[PDB]
């Protein structure tokens, strides 16, 4: 399918069918779509919205979170699992208090050297908030594209990670780019699942090579 067309099939699927009333989409600034995206990386929406809450009326701001102690962070992120995220989550306020006069930098390289924040995280956080052109690659991001492209091999190997962030950079457009990015999570999260994937409400099934073939159970490839 040619870039263009992806991204255009995409857009036009999320202005009728997208989420746009999560409270992370609501006057959104850097540091709600970094808490958010945190807090996301592996619990699921449902779980998230009330810590999401909580945490954004005891810390209005970064500073605020930066100057409480790590045992009252550690105390509301109770039933939210993996708690390196919050250990990181409090570092990287710090950080940003610290290096930044408490308020969100807006170069990648800053924000991506921020403690528990990656290369996708950071471009979600530039994207979604400020209209910056990165794309993003979580896994379910990564299984639409890998779907539909027919990107087969475990993207644990780097060859196949970079034929992924290759890909993601060509369909993900300039203009639109954060009704783009919220779209394909959407996608991966409630219609390309990773078990009998709903092509029949999916926007890219007329160019998806996994859909023509009934092939959706070989992409991405797992682990040898
Ligand atoms: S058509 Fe099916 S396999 Fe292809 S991207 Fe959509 S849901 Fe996934």
Same mark, same amino acid.
């Given at each position: 399918?040619?870039?263009? !067309?992806?991204?255009?099939?995409?857009?036009? +699927?999320?202005?009728?069918?997208? &989420?746009?009333?999560?409270? +992370? !989409?609501?006057?959104?600034?850097?540091?709600?779509? @970094?808490?958010?995206?945190?807090?996301?990386?592996?619990? #699921? *929406?449902?779980?998230?919205?009330?810590?999401?809450?909580?945490?954004?009326?005891?810390?209005?701001?970064?500073?605020?979170?930066?100057?409480?102690?790590?045992?009252? *962070?550690?105390?509301? @992120?109770?039933?939210? /699992?993996?708690?390196?995220?919050?250990?990181?989550?409090?570092?990287?306020? #710090? !950080?940003?208090?610290?290096?930044?006069?408490?308020?969100?930098?807006?170069?990648?390289?800053?924000?991506?050297?921020?403690?528990?924040? /990656? &290369?996708?995280?950071?471009?979600?956080?530039?994207?979604?908030?400020?209209?910056?052109?990165?794309?993003?690659?979580?896994?379910?991001?990564? &299984?639409?594209?890998? &779907?539909?492209?027919?990107?087969? /091999? +475990?993207?644990?190997?780097?060859?196949?990670?970079?034929?992924? +962030?290759?890909?993601?950079?060509?369909?993900?457009?300039?203009? /639109?780019?954060?009704?783009?990015?919220?779209?394909?999570?959407?996608?991966?999260?409630?219609?390309?699942?990773?078990?009998?994937?709903?092509?029949?409400?999916?926007?890219?099934?007329?160019?998806?090579?996994?859909?023509?073939?009934?092939? @959706?159970?070989?992409?991405?490839?797992?682990?040898?």
């Amino acid at each position: 399918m040619q870039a263009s !067309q992806f991204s255009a099939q995409v857009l036009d +699927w999320y202005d009728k069918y997208g &989420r746009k009333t999560l409270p +992370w !989409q609501i006057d959104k600034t850097p540091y709600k779509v @970094w808490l958010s995206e945190v807090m996301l990386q592996q619990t #699921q *929406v449902a779980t998230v919205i009330p810590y999401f809450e909580r945490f954004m009326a005891r810390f209005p701001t970064v500073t605020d979170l930066a100057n409480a102690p790590l045992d009252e *962070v550690l105390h509301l @992120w109770t039933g939210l /699992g993996y708690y390196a995220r919050a250990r990181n989550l409090h570092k990287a306020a #710090q !950080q940003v208090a610290t290096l930044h006069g408490g308020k969100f930098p807006e170069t990648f390289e800053e924000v991506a050297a921020l403690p528990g924040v /990656g &290369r996708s995280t950071a471009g979600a956080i530039l994207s979604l908030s400020l209209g910056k052109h990165f794309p993003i690659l979580d896994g379910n991001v990564a &299984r639409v594209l890998a &779907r539909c492209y027919a990107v087969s /091999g +475990w993207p644990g190997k780097k060859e196949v990670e970079n034929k992924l +962030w290759s890909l993601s950079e060509q369909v993900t457009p300039a203009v /639109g780019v954060e009704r783009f990015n919220q779209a394909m999570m959407d996608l991966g999260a409630m219609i390309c699942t990773r078990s009998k994937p709903k092509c029949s409400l999916c926007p890219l099934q007329n160019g998806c090579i996994a859909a023509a073939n009934n092939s @959706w159970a070989l992409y991405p490839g797992k682990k040898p």
